[PDB]
Design a protein around this ligand. Structure first.
Ligand SMILES: O=C(O)c1cccc(-c2ccco2)c1
Length: 284
């Protein structure tokens, strides 16, 4: 069923809350035993948001390999994403270790450091060129190279140095700065513009490790970004673009990380973004 007609049918019937609960009911449940070990309590931002054991990213160290991060591998679309929480004061070094070890080119940040008067994630990147950051626990140096501030987002060029080998890499930081404190954006135009800027950078392409995507918990806004990207790519690839079923793509993604798309409004916004984005994919 053409999702644009499914959309008008759910809207006219006001059944978004009902569709959403149906997804919550059918979603996978896998063990998260490593996340719940007592040694890892200060590595988790939220007690109810944990990576599954089968899909968790492992840090390359014998001490403690744990980070709150999941590999979402989309087989038909040929795209992979790492979804993670906003870094905590004691996990900023783990965060950059993961970027280094997974060979990522891009970090996508969908939250502000402060929202609703509370801290949603650590200040994990340098704000001035001449004030670099050293992560002594993981032996990394991070330097701000350049910053481009636009109305709806900021792009930063960062240099990450492995102090052990003196290898360096360029990381691109894509920071969506205008998601509202409550609810979802009224139009998806600025979110799609942002998604197309990440794609244009090479950050989502198979010559690099998976893109790292986060918000505060790494399930809600983060879920919306990867769901929209994957659905538009499948509409490009398939003989019949009207066969793309957004609810079925979301359940596939929930096999790899719990809780993706946190509200019925985020579900409705994901539909709007895919429907408006398809008017480019189909030749405009
Ligand atoms: O990434 C870096 O370490 C670096 C160092 C010097 C110059 C530039 C640069 C990028 C685009 C034009 O010049 C980048």
């Amino acid at each position: 069923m053409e999702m644009e007609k499914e959309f008008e049918q759910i809207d006219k019937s006001g059944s978004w809350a009902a569709i959403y609960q149906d997804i919550r009911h059918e979603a996978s449940d896998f063990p998260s035993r490593v996340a719940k070990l007592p040694k890892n309590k200060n590595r988790n931002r939220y007690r109810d948001v944990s990576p599954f054991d089968h899909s968790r990213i492992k840090l390359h160290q014998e001490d403690n390999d744990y980070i709150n991060a999941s590999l979402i591998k989309m087989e038909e679309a040929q795209r992979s994403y790492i979804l993670t929480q906003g870094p905590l004061p004691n996990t900023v070094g783990h965060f950059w270790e993961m970027v280094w070890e997974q060979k990522s080119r891009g970090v996508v940040m969908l939250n502000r450091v402060m929202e609703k008067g509370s801290l949603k994630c650590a200040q994990y990147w340098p704000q001035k060129e001449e004030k670099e950051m050293i992560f002594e626990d993981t032996n990394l140096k991070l330097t701000l190279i350049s910053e481009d501030i636009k109305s709806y987002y900021t792009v930063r060029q960062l240099e990450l140095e492995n102090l052990t080998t003196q290898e360096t890499r360029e990381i691109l930081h894509f920071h969506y700065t205008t998601w509202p404190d409550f609810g979802v954006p009224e139009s998806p135009a600025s979110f799609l513009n942002f998604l197309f800027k990440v794609r244009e950078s090479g950050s989502l392409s198979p010559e690099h490790g998976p893109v790292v995507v986060h918000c505060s918990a790494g399930i809600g806004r983060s879920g919306t970004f990867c769901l929209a990207d994957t659905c538009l790519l499948l509409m490009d690839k398939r003989k019949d673009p009207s066969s793309v079923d957004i609810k079925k793509v979301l359940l596939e993604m929930r096999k790899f990380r719990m809780g993706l798309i946190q509200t019925a409004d985020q579900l409705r916004f994901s539909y709007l973004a895919v429907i408006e984005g398809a008017k480019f994919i189909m030749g405009d």
